[PDB]
Amino acid sequence: LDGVIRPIGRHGIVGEKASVLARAAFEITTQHLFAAAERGEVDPLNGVVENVLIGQPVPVGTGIVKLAMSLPLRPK
Amino acid sequence: MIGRKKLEEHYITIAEAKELLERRHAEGLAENPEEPMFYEARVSLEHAERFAKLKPEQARELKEKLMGLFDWINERIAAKLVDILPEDYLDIRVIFAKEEYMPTPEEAEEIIKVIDEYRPLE
Amino acid sequence: FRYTRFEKARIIGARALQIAMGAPVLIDVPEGITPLQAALLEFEKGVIPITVIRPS
Amino acid sequence: MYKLLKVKDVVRIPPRMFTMDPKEAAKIVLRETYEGIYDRDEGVVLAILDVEEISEGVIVPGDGATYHEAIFNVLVWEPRNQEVVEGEVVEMMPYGAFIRIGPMDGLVHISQLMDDYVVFDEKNRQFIGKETNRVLKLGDYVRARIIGVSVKSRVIRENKINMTMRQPGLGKFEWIEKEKK
């Protein structure tokens, strides 16, 4: 994805860019890595491991659709 | 912030806000709990029932008129003059004792000349 | 304008929760039915009120 | 002094009254949320007048009720500082007197009453001056000025306003008329 091929674990795509909490539960090293982004770092949202960690519906699947409905609602 | 935004506000005298309570009191007239209005609403109704000195519509007309007479009188200052009904320079002192401009006896008399009409005279 | 499989399983899910909290039912009566099965029969006749939004 | 507002807010219609007209059903929700509540930023919200326009509904995962974005009109009352008010003596106390300036009250202490040394008559409910034979008692219409407002909580009941009348042109209205000359 970035012009030079990467590995898959602990030095590559998981260790590469994501949310900073996504790198916490993988590569049990965390005092190397979680204290690195202790200095000057925000963390928005929008992973899959984060919304399950906080109590939100994940973006994939059925938490992607948005409904809308008006309200006379006569039975007939 | 209350809600998302606050976009428009106006100033209402005591004689004008009396009609908003009674038209609200026209609801209830709902008969399922009979809707008695709550206690502090009925207390503020009694302050409107006893200090109603003017018509509701003629107070709205006067507030437009008093803003065009002087530039330093805005809508907020003009609504105060309807409730007090000043007669001389004594009331001009006590309202304007903490203001940026103290009026001259010429300019204070010109306010009285507009409010020489619409007086109950009793 | 056919629905997908992810939108059809959310419209049923939201309508089965209204049908338990009030929200008077259409002609769906007989004799005893769990509130999920009431949403399947209303969806069969194509009288769902809820419509989707298509982000584009 | 009262004010009239026009404020948008998000309305939550439950699915119990889901089969009513959208205007008054959004009115009955938002009315029983803000009436009679003193905020520290604006003031006493008295009553909701009416609902002009309403938006569409949006469903949220978990609840099953609906959300709307309505437009309504609100009558507020803001007792701001050094505001010239009018009132009615509706309470007699040995340390002061509550002056009702509307939905709330205004307390004036016994030594900010008038330009006179003031002695509280304990047997009756009145104040008797030393030199002048002026009598301040129950029910008398007065005129005052706010000097201090103590705002503690969201309830109307628990907030009280201190005023004073030691100025030329205040007090009872027939006292004011004789001070014109």
UniProtKB/Swiss-Prot annotation, chain A:
This chain's source organism reads Thermococcus kodakarensis (strain ATCC BAA-918 / JCM 12380 / KOD1)
According to the record's subunit comment, the protein's assembly and interactions are: Part of the RNA polymerase complex.
What are the subcellular locations of this protein?
Cytoplasm; Chromosome
The organism's lineage? Answer: Archaea, Methanobacteriati, Methanobacteriota, Thermococci, Thermococcales
Section covered of the full-length record: 314 to 389 of 391
Q: What does this protein do?
A: DNA-dependent RNA polymerase (RNAP) catalyzes the transcription of DNA into RNA using the four ribonucleoside triphosphates as substrates. Forms part of the jaw domain.
What protein name is recorded for this chain?
Answer: DNA-directed RNA polymerase subunit Rpo1C
User: To which protein family does this belong?
Assistant: Belongs to the RNA polymerase beta' chain family.
Curated annotation (Swiss-Prot), chain C:
The UniProt GO MF terms for this protein read:
DNA binding; DNA-directed RNA polymerase activity
Instruction: Write down the EC number.
Output: 2.7.7.6
Q: Taxonomically, which superkingdom?
A: Archaea
**A Gene Ontology CC term for this entry?**
DNA-directed RNA polymerase complex
Q: Give the SUPFAM superfamilies listed for this entry.
A: RPB6/omega subunit-like
Task: Please give the chief subcellular localization of this protein.
Answer: cytoplasm
Question: GO terms for biological process?
Answer: DNA-templated transcription
Does the keyword field hold Nucleotidyltransferase? yes
Identify one Pfam family in the record.
RNA_pol_Rpb6
InterPro entries to which the protein is assigned, alphabetical: DNA-dir_RNA_polK_14-18kDa_CS, Pol_omega/Rpo6/RPB6, RPB6/omega-like_sf, Rpo6/Rpb6
Q: Where in the cell is it found?
A: Cytoplasm; Chromosome
Q: Which PROSITE patterns does the UniProt entry name for this protein?
A: RNA_POL_K_14KD
From the UniProt record, list the reaction(s) this protein catalyses: RNA(n) + a ribonucleoside 5'-triphosphate = RNA(n+1) + diphosphate
Q: Could you tell me the keywords of this UniProt record?
A: Chromosome, Cytoplasm, DNA-directed RNA polymerase, Nucleotidyltransferase, Transcription, Transferase
Q: What does this protein do?
A: DNA-dependent RNA polymerase (RNAP) catalyzes the transcription of DNA into RNA using the four ribonucleoside triphosphates as substrates.
Q: Subunit arrangement?
A: Part of the RNA polymerase complex.
Family membership noted in the UniProt record:
Belongs to the archaeal Rpo6/eukaryotic RPB6 RNA polymerase subunit family.
**Protein's UniProt name:** DNA-directed RNA polymerase subunit Rpo6
Which species does this protein come from? Answer: Thermococcus kodakarensis (strain ATCC BAA-918 / JCM 12380 / KOD1)
